[PDB]
Design an enzyme around this catalytic site. Structure first.
Site: not given
Ligand SMILES: CC(=O)Nc1cc(-c2[nH]c3c(c2-c2ccc(F)nc2)C(=O)NCC3)ccn1
Length: 303
Positions: A20-22, A36, A137
């Site tokens: 969930f979330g972008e 996110k 998950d």
């Molecule tokens: C290059 C690049 O994508 N970097 C990157 C991506 C994320 C990230 N990727 C995913 C998630 C998150 C993310 C982001 C903020 C947060 F609070 N929790 C999680 C996520 O929730 N789900 C799967 C995919 C986090 C840090 N660096």
């Protein structure tokens, strides 16, 4: 103030999505952070994930570093934010698609994933106690790769926390919540006893075994390696149903293929044995994350 807050963060680039979330890359006082963003109607999902990240004593090198949960009102609507450390490599799925790894690289990724999972699974008894947590998950798309080549576990929204004195879980879990391709046999056939927290730990280990298979395929020795594939790429369609997975995993009893060239290297023999011992249909028979961490630590030391 000194704490990181949403009003002081400027979004720069769309970098994907969570369950969930972008997800966006943003800047906070010159530093990159990942954000996110959830809508107002997704408050339950955002709040639950914020709750898990705020668990006492959760922080660990192999768990994504949580910074803040906050709200941001733009004057029309409110966004709900989760802010974390930013990792330029993105997910393990992205990293494994782009690169091949050395034997050292493979052990670093597998060991760091098992260390993060063992920390999540472990209860810390004490004044500032940490409950045991199961992810529900785990997959290569929600494991991130740091600049130092180690992993950290992310997307904890579906996690469950245990109260060991009663053997109770903090939520009433729904059946089959995760990613179908990575669902353990007992989740696919709905035989899992969801009243026992240990059942969730055991299901995470099966999924970690699948992730180890994805890493091992990319381990290049003398220029020899396999191409990137998701587990079961040879047996199910992309976006498989529970029924398609169940027929393969529960009924035909197949697992991802262990290539012959993995018997020729000590590190690949150790990894292949770990996989097999994560893949039994019966969760009670699987290795624990702590045992896998011990095995890969012994292997990392030697190599
Ligand atoms: C290059 C690049 O994508 N970097 C990157 C991506 C994320 C990230 N990727 C995913 C998630 C998150 C993310 C982001 C903020 C947060 F609070 N929790 C999680 C996520 O929730 N789900 C799967 C995919 C986090 C840090 N660096």
């Amino acid at each position: 103030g000194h704490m990181t807050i949403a009003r002081d963060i400027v979004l720069q680039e769309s970098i994907g999505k969570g369950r969930f979330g972008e997800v966006w890359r943003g800047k906070w006082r010159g530093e990159e952070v990942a954000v996110k963003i959830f809508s107002s109607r997704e408050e339950r999902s955002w709040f639950r994930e914020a709750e898990i990240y705020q668990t006492v004593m959760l922080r660990h090198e192999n768990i994504l570093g949580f910074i803040a949960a906050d709200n941001k009102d733009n004057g029309t609507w409110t966004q709900l934010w989760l802010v974390s450390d930013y990792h330029e490599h993105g997910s393990l799925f992205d990293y494994l698609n782009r690169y091949t790894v050395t034997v050292e690289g493979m052990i670093k990724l597998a060991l760091s994933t098992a260390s993060g999972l063992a920390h999540l699974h472990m209860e810390i008894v004490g004044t500032q106690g940490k409950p045991a947590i199961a992810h529900r998950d785990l997959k290569s798309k929600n494991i991130l790769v740091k600049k130092n080549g180690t992993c950290c576990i992310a997307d904890l929204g579906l996690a469950v926390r245990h109260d060991s004195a009663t053997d109770t879980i903090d939520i009433a879990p729904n059946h089959r919540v995760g990613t179908k391709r990575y669902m353990a046999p007992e989740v696919l056939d709905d035989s899992i006893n969801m009243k026992h927290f240990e059942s969730f730990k055991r299901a995470d280990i099966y999924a970690m075994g699948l992730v180890f298979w994805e890493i091992a395929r990319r381990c290049s020795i003398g220029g020899i390696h396999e191409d990137y594939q998701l587990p079961y790429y040879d047996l199910v369609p992309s976006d498989p149903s529970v029924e398609e997975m169940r027929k393969v995993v529960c009924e035909q009893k197949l697992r991802p293929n262990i290539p012959n060239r993995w018997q020729s290297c000590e590190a690949l023999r150790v990894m292949a044995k770990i996989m097999r011992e994560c893949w039994y249909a019966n969760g009670a028979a699987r290795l624990t994350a702590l045992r896998i961490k011990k095995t890969l630590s012994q292997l990392s030391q030697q190599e």
